[PDB]
């Protein structure tokens, strides 16, 4: 069986990785100005439909950071 991430598993990873960073499903990757014809895909069609890498979860994670003692 293939290894994919869908449902709570997908949301769990984003929440477990990004957490309070605020992950986004739709984000640029190639070019959204010169190319007109383009389908809608981000983390679902990329990892749910196809087998991706967990490292991608970090990309969606925002640059901001919550509060912590240091």
């Amino acid at each position: 069986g293939p290894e994919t991430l869908c449902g709570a598993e997908l949301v769990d990873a984003l929440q477990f990785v990004c957490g309070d960073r605020g992950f986004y499903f739709n984000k640029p990757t190639g070019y959204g100005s010169s190319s007109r014809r383009a389908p809608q895909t981000g983390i679902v069609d990329e990892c749910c439909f196809r087998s991706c890498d967990l490292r991608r979860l970090e990309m969606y994670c925002a640059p901001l950071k919550p509060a912590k003692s240091a």
């Binding site: 290894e3 990873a13 967990l54």
Partner: peptide, 16 residues
């Protein structure tokens, strides 16, 4: 070991 290796690793890592 590394958590970001497979789809299963993520579950085991979190579900602990």
């Amino acid at each position: 070991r590394n958590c970001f290796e497979s789809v299963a690793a993520l579950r085991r890592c979190m579900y602990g």
